[PDB]
Design a protein around this ligand. Sequence first.
Ligand SMILES: *[C@@H](C)[C@H]1/C(=C/c2[nH]c(/C=C3N=C(/C=C4\NC(=O)C(CC)=C4C)C(C)=C\3CCC(=O)O)c(CCC(=O)O)c2C)NC(=O)[C@@H]1C
Ligand SMILES: *[C@H](C)[C@H]1/C(=C/c2[nH]c(/C=C3N=C(/C=C4\NC(=O)C(CC)=C4C)C(C)=C\3CCC(=O)O)c(CCC(=O)O)c2C)NC(=O)[C@@H]1C
Ligand SMILES: *[C@H](C)[C@H]1/C(=C/c2[nH]c(/C=C3N=C(/C=C4\NC(=O)C(CC)=C4C)C(C)=C\3CCC(=O)O)c(CCC(=O)O)c2C)NC(=O)[C@@H]1C
Ligand SMILES: *[C@H](C)[C@H]1/C(=C/c2[nH]c(/C=C3N=C(/C=C4\NC(=O)C(CC)=C4C)C(C)=C\3CCC(=O)O)c(CCC(=O)O)c2C)NC(=O)[C@@H]1C
Ligand SMILES: *[C@H](C)[C@H]1/C(=C/c2[nH]c(/C=C3N=C(/C=C4\NC(=O)C(CC)=C4C)C(C)=C\3CCC(=O)O)c(CCC(=O)O)c2C)NC(=O)[C@@H]1C
Ligand SMILES: *[C@H](C)[C@H]1/C(=C/c2[nH]c(/C=C3N=C(/C=C4\NC(=O)C(CC)=C4C)C(C)=C\3CCC(=O)O)c(CCC(=O)O)c2C)NC(=O)[C@@H]1C
Ligand SMILES: *[C@H](C)[C@H]1/C(=C/c2[nH]c(/C=C3N=C(/C=C4\NC(=O)C(CC)=C4C)C(C)=C\3CCC(=O)O)c(CCC(=O)O)c2C)NC(=O)[C@@H]1C
Ligand SMILES: *[C@H](C)[C@H]1/C(=C/c2[nH]c(/C=C3N=C(/C=C4\NC(=O)C(CC)=C4C)C(C)=C\3CCC(=O)O)c(CCC(=O)O)c2C)NC(=O)[C@@H]1C
Lengths: 160, 161, 161, 161, 161, 36, 160, 160, 160, 160, 169, 49
Amino acid sequence: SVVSQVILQADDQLRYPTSGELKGIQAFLTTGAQRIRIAETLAENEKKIVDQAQKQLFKKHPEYRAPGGNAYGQRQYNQCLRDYGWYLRLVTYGVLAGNKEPIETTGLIGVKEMYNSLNVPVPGMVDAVTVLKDAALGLLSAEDANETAPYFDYIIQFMS
Amino acid sequence: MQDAITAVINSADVQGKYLDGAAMDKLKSYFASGELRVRAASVISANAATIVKEAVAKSLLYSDVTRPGGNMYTTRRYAACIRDLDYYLRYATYAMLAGDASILDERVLNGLKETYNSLGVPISSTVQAIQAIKEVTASLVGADAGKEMGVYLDYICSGLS
Amino acid sequence: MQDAITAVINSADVQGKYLDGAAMDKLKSYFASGELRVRAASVISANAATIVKEAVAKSLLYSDVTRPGGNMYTTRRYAACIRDLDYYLRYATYAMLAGDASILDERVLNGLKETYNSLGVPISSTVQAIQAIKEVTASLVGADAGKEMGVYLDYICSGLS
Amino acid sequence: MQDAITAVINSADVQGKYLDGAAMDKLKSYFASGELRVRAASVISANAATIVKEAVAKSLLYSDVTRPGGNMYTTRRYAACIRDLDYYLRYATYAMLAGDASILDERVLNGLKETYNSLGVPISSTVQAIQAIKEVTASLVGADAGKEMGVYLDYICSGLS
Amino acid sequence: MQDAITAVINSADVQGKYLDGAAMDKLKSYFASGELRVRAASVISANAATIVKEAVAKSLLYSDVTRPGGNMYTTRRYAACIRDLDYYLRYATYAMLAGDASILDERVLNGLKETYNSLGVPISSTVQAIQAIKEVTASLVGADAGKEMGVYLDYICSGLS
Amino acid sequence: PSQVAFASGDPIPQNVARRTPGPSLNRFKEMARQVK
Amino acid sequence: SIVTKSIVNADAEARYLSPGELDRIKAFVTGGAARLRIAETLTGSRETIVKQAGDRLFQKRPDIVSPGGNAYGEEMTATCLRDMDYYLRLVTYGVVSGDVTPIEEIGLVGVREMYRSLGTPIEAVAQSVREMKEVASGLMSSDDAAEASAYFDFVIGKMS
Amino acid sequence: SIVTKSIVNADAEARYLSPGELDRIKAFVTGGAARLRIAETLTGSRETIVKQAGDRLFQKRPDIVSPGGNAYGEEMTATCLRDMDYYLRLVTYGVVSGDVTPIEEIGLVGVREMYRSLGTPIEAVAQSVREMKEVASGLMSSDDAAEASAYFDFVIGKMS
Amino acid sequence: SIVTKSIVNADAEARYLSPGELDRIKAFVTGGAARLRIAETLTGSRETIVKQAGDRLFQKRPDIVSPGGNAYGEEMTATCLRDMDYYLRLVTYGVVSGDVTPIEEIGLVGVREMYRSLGTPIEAVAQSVREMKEVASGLMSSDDAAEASAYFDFVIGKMS
Amino acid sequence: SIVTKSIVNADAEARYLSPGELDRIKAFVTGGAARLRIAETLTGSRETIVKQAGDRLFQKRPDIVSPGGNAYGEEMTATCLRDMDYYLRLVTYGVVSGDVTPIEEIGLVGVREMYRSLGTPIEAVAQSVREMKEVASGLMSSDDAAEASAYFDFVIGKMS
Amino acid sequence: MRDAVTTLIKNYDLTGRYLDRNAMDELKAYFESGSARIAAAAMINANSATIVKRAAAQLFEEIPELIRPSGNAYTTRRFSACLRDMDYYLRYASYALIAADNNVLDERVLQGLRETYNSLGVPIGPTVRGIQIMKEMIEAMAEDSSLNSTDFIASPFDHMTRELSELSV
Amino acid sequence: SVKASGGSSLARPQLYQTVPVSAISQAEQQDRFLEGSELNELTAYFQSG
Ligand SMILES: *[C@@H](C)[C@H]1/C(=C/c2[nH]c(/C=C3N=C(/C=C4\NC(=O)C(CC)=C4C)C(C)=C\3CCC(=O)O)c(CCC(=O)O)c2C)NC(=O)[C@@H]1C
Ligand SMILES: *[C@H](C)[C@H]1/C(=C/c2[nH]c(/C=C3N=C(/C=C4\NC(=O)C(CC)=C4C)C(C)=C\3CCC(=O)O)c(CCC(=O)O)c2C)NC(=O)[C@@H]1C
Ligand SMILES: *[C@H](C)[C@H]1/C(=C/c2[nH]c(/C=C3N=C(/C=C4\NC(=O)C(CC)=C4C)C(C)=C\3CCC(=O)O)c(CCC(=O)O)c2C)NC(=O)[C@@H]1C
Ligand SMILES: *[C@H](C)[C@H]1/C(=C/c2[nH]c(/C=C3N=C(/C=C4\NC(=O)C(CC)=C4C)C(C)=C\3CCC(=O)O)c(CCC(=O)O)c2C)NC(=O)[C@@H]1C
Ligand SMILES: *[C@H](C)[C@H]1/C(=C/c2[nH]c(/C=C3N=C(/C=C4\NC(=O)C(CC)=C4C)C(C)=C\3CCC(=O)O)c(CCC(=O)O)c2C)NC(=O)[C@@H]1C
Ligand SMILES: *[C@H](C)[C@H]1/C(=C/c2[nH]c(/C=C3N=C(/C=C4\NC(=O)C(CC)=C4C)C(C)=C\3CCC(=O)O)c(CCC(=O)O)c2C)NC(=O)[C@@H]1C
Ligand SMILES: *[C@H](C)[C@H]1/C(=C/c2[nH]c(/C=C3N=C(/C=C4\NC(=O)C(CC)=C4C)C(C)=C\3CCC(=O)O)c(CCC(=O)O)c2C)NC(=O)[C@@H]1C
Ligand SMILES: *[C@H](C)[C@H]1/C(=C/c2[nH]c(/C=C3N=C(/C=C4\NC(=O)C(CC)=C4C)C(C)=C\3CCC(=O)O)c(CCC(=O)O)c2C)NC(=O)[C@@H]1C
């Protein structure tokens, strides 16, 4: 969390946490209620988002279902849906935490070579995360979309 | 030295292209500011000596700097301090006319700290003298052109920092 | 580094001959002055911070340098100046105990002028601070040990200048 | 500066002896290899503009260095680069005539590195230009004369690097 | 560092064409001379100590360099000079097997003038030392292989001079 | 035993092309075409 | 500054700016008006804070102004008031900047050995900062008093 | 520019700007719209002035495009037209700045040494810029083409 | 010497010399008459120890002067006795300094690689300094022989 | 001790002790009897030395026994006299050992943190040790007090 | 590393002055521009990879000799190094847009860039050409998007262009 | 512009590795002559060249 980042900076510089970062924890505690609301609505309405994202990706990129790809079987189809569900799940996790560090410890560090070893295209997945962003921000309300957009946006940035 | 027009021309020439619309906009903005810059330069050029007089009376006079044992004590050092404040006022007028601090980088701040440290010139006292020049010029010209002059006077101070 | 003993040994060694009587008189003078050097170094090591305190109070306090815009304005830069004076006093005691100014030219001076020029440190004012250190040390320790310390303090000043 | 003969004379002088047999053999080697140096210097003095023109065509023309933004862009910078290459070719001819690269240290390489780093001159681009000079003069002047010219131009490149 | 193959292939890649008529000749000369250069380097690596043994016996011993007051007087300075001649022999073998002096430019000649002029090493004396190494290797490994070593050895001499 | 001389031997002359205007001057090249 | 810390923390991990530190930056921006109000109050009342705090300090600790004290004499008393004015100006800088980094960089590094070389009791200077905190807390509202006393207590911690 | 030239002259005389110099700068900033209209005219007709002037130069001095000439061939002709366009851009910069200093710092100092290194006929480049002046005066009005022709004639005088 | 060593150690520890070194410096200063007496005795008899030690070494080890030996030759023997005079001079330097640091900095570091690049037997050089030690102990009194012979067999132990 | 730090230096240089160092051990052994009778004399006079030190401290700096001082009360003055007696015992250990290593490794590393935590006036403790110096030089002979005053000056310099 | 509030504090601290009405006006201007700066930086984070790809494509079609032999975008190693340099420029431009100060650009971009590019032969003209191409495409994208204030976006790129650029006149 | 310069010394990055550069640098970083390993390296490469 941002509390964890502030407390690690305090332990790094060998002193108690300071005024501005304590106001940062206070601002986090004020916005945590709407963060919990975002987590609740995304968890209850994840299914339409993952379905719309998978049809949008697989009509934008006609090569994984085509010969010469990697998503032929239903087990690979369910694996791609599982990757979508885990990515949206980790985004809700980081929205609850207030920042990126749970996603960095769960689904970011080593993701490029992780999918190079499994031959899944990284630009294909940045297109996947952008169309999943389009689905989620279309489903979610306006200032809520503005609040939750930089988490997805950092996901596309860290992927590529 | 570079003014605003020469800075735009230098940027476009290193780009290698002709002047696009952003160059037109920056040139028109400089021409909009130019009449205020010329009026301020004319007023400062008329009142060149009185600004230095008021700044010296405000900041340096009747102090340990001008008392015996001070670096403004001996009258050749006093006249040198007067000429230094004329330098700062004239080059700040140049920088305000140009819309740029390039002349301050090339001719004023070039080795000035080493020069003053070799001479024994008081750095914070001449910083307060330039500050007094800034206040007198802001009182004498106005808020807008005084602020514009104070930008380059603070640039001279931060170079002396 | 070289003390007086290593200095006369290397001076004999470069021309390759043994110790003569005139080289032995150098050791006679050094062993005559050795216990004076020992007691002077003991006194200065006892009162190391006190000399720097009275030197800054005598020369540098209430001058331009501590005022805002000066080189000793911030507390970090004041602590750095106190650190530099501690360096100068400790290495001057080292050179006084060695009886040869090799440690000063090897570890204090060969690279300090351009460092101070890059930092903007006033060399004339820190030379005056070292002179204040010399005056306070000569008051504290005595005449002969005071001028013996002052020889290497002037060596530091000459290396800085 | 010194040539091979002057280097032999200075070495024997600081040794304090007359010319022994090895010095005579080195002198005989230089006296044998002098005529090819003479005719090589005649050829280079004949075509001295042509190596510079052709090598600039070999390495620097229609590239980023002469393109807008590059360091050889404007006509004053082009003339400065042509002047620098003329200096390199003339001093390499001098070093080839002397049979020693001491003139390159005394005249060329004593301040050229810091001069170019102050000027912002691309040392890599000058290295490619001097290698082009080397290739053109090796095509023009012969095999062993081209080898000697390449040795002194690689000395210029090693001084730049 | 880079070798002859890298120099050829970089020239070809900068030109953007294939290996048409002269790159093939350079590479076939390189691959032809390679095995005998490897044999020569094998002999030099086997007899590396003895080359500097009678090289220093022929060049530097029984001189004022080795006498008191000389730069090769003490045992530490002697061992450092022996290690430097070993460095010169090893990097000359490196440049011979590479077919280019880029290893000498990148690991030897980049700071050799700096360290020798700062320390006080006699340039003429170490040039005579590398010349002694050249004639010793020419005697010990053959005339043509010794000359192939000697072109890089007197490249190092020209870099020193 | 005489074939060791790679660097000591006769150096081989090189075929380096003189640098030509590239595609940064495409408009000037087609301008020269249509002017002729 | 807060913006300085966020950009530095992003650049140390070589990424762009994360959503958590962007939220902390916009919290800093929204609190800028309140911080400017607090700093304007302090710089408007800068003379009476120094006057009243110096009076309370010299009444509570008469030893430092007694003969043999460090601040005995008119010039030393004026220099002590100048030091209190310096620290009040640093407090205004910290309130403007939103954290304690200008205070720490300008006037809290080497203060211990600085005042040790001066011969000045560092706990008495901390008491002077405490009286400045009390006067400044009395001259504003409660939340503004807490916000300014955060920086004041940072100066207390670094000087004691 | 005229401002930099006046500042350089007043600095060499160690004085402020003259009232006549200030009146010239006022006239310059009022005529800014007209001179930037000349600038946009030249950028509109950049490819036609060089075209007609190169045609006139090639029909006037056919030794330029003859075999053995400096500009013999397609690519050398293209380089000659590129140098022509460079000088047109420098004239545009000069009429914008109101001074010949941006012209002369880029394309007139060392031009003789550059063109004797390249073998190029300097008087033929001067004739090329003369033809550019005539084409610009053709597709420009009277007084403004006289204004641009002042800077063009400076190029002619400093080159030839 | 011990002065140089103590000053260098205190400079490494960034502190003044403690009185536990100051008493050492003043006692080493007061006890210098014996060391200068040893040094003047050695430099008064300096050639005689070289003569006797060379005679005893060439008697004890005939293979030094044998054909095929390292010192086979007139200038070989001359430089051999010159090295013996060198090491006697270094012993007098160590006696003067009261420490073995001049002997280390002149003629102990690199001795092994030096004599391998000379071909000279290091154990025979050690034997030479040994016969130096017995000749000096024969011609100078007992405790004086102990003080000089300590430096002598330190040189022997550094050789072999 | 000086012998154990000579062992430390010889182990750091990976060698046996130099003959100068054995001469230092010689001088240490010969001065041991005089240093031991110095230590015996002052530990015989260990009581009145600290009583007069406490009374002289009370006359020098009277705010310690005043209300508001650290040593207000009979048990507080008893603990102050106990601390002074313990520092006197450290002077005994230093004079016995021959170096300032026992004072450094018992009661001089962390003395600043110790007395800053305790609130003790460190300059007043330095004044107490200075009064101990005065009364010790009063009841001690000239060379003996000169030998003890070097260790006393080390205590003053490192503690004050 | 200094932002606008930090450099204003340093400028006033050098003179030993309290924050006057001009200083509070500058701080108010920064704090009212800060929302637009944050929105612009979030936009920069959004289209960063696509903007560096299309800016590199526009640069290499404007100056085609870079991707040809003897150019410094020739190999894919040189190509990826150029993309990394352009991404570095965009990242520090985002940092300077948030900070409202070019001191981050001075401290961390420009103080050794001429030295590195002259050491490795990397051109300094197409570099600032690509930087300005990034500036034009980002300014056009911000004009397309719902950004009320877009005047501050050109300042870090123009500072990079002026500081890294060579003095032609 | 920039107010200081660290100096632009010439940098020579290795564009690609060839096996003579590999063996020579391999023993050069280990501060030794090419022993029999690097000799067999260059021998096999010069035979296949
Ligand atoms: C005989 C060669 C001459 C001589 C030489 C001499 N050299 C040194 C010391 C040094 N030499 C170097 C040089 C290099 N180190 C490297 O790694 C390389 C590239 C492979 C080179 C060229 C250096 C760095 C030193 C100093 C430290 C070291 O030993 O490496 C000395 C000693 C100087 C001293 O006083 O300590 C000497 C004497 N001296 C002569 O008289 C011959 C002409
Ligand atoms: C008296 C004969 C006339 C006169 C005097 C007057 N002087 C001043 C102010 C200053 N004069 C000096 C001059 C010197 N400083 C030096 O060190 C020396 C030589 C040793 C000289 C001559 C200075 C420095 C001042 C400034 C005072 C200060 O210390 O700051 C004034 C005051 C002007 C004002 O407006 O304050 C006056 C009135 N005036 C006359 O009418 C007499 C002819
Ligand atoms: C055309 C009117 C005549 C002509 C021209 C010609 N020029 C060149 C080569 C070059 N000209 C320049 C000049 C400039 N560069 C600048 O940046 C400026 C100021 C803006 C000027 C004036 C340069 C640098 C070159 C070198 C080419 C390059 O950029 O790499 C040529 C080519 C000659 C060759 O390639 O060897 C020609 C043909 N020649 C004529 O006969 C016309 C009279
Ligand atoms: C040409 C190969 C490349 C290059 C050259 C270039 N050099 C300069 C400017 C200067 N060069 C020198 C160097 C010297 N000083 C000496 O004493 C000698 C001979 C022993 C030399 C060679 C100096 C002093 C200057 C400064 C001249 C001046 O004040 O203008 C420039 C000009 C840079 C400018 O800003 O004007 C250039 C372009 N740069 C390249 O890109 C070519 C590859
Ligand atoms: C007052 C709260 C206490 C105190 C003060 C006191 N201070 C001094 C002298 C100096 N203090 C400083 C410190 C600073 N300079 C700076 O620029 C800053 C940060 C902005 C600080 C903290 C300095 C430099 C001095 C020296 C004066 C000079 O300008 O040269 C004194 C005088 C000591 C003397 O012997 O002269 C005093 C008395 N003393 C107290 O008892 C109060 C607790
Ligand atoms: C004699 C005890 C043994 C012996 C000697 C021998 N030495 C040499 C040659 C040299 N020895 C040195 C040694 C030093 N010079 C110094 O300045 C110092 C430090 C003080 C030392 C240790 C040197 C430099 C030489 C070279 C001669 C010169 O001065 O230039 C030789 C000659 C070997 C040769 O090949 O010429 C000999 C024979 N040999 C023995 O067997 C005895 C054990
Ligand atoms: C598709 C069947 C073929 C193809 C087309 C294509 N290539 C590019 C652009 C580039 N090609 C490269 C390739 C290389 N770099 C190297 O160092 C090597 C040798 C190993 C190669 C082959 C690069 C770096 C580029 C980008 C630079 C450029 O624009 O030239 C394009 C253009 C893409 C665009 O305009 O955005 C196209 C259409 N490449 C293939 O490999 C197939 C043969
Ligand atoms: C792309 C716009 C241009 C280009 C780029 C290019 N750069 C390099 C190599 C380096 N670039 C840097 C620069 C930086 N280091 C930093 O830390 C920062 C700021 C955060 C910068 C801007 C450095 C240090 C290098 C060297 C090693 C590295 O890549 O880190 C290359 C490679 C050249 C080579 O041969 O190795 C290239 C190609 N080249 C162009 O032509 C474009 C104009």
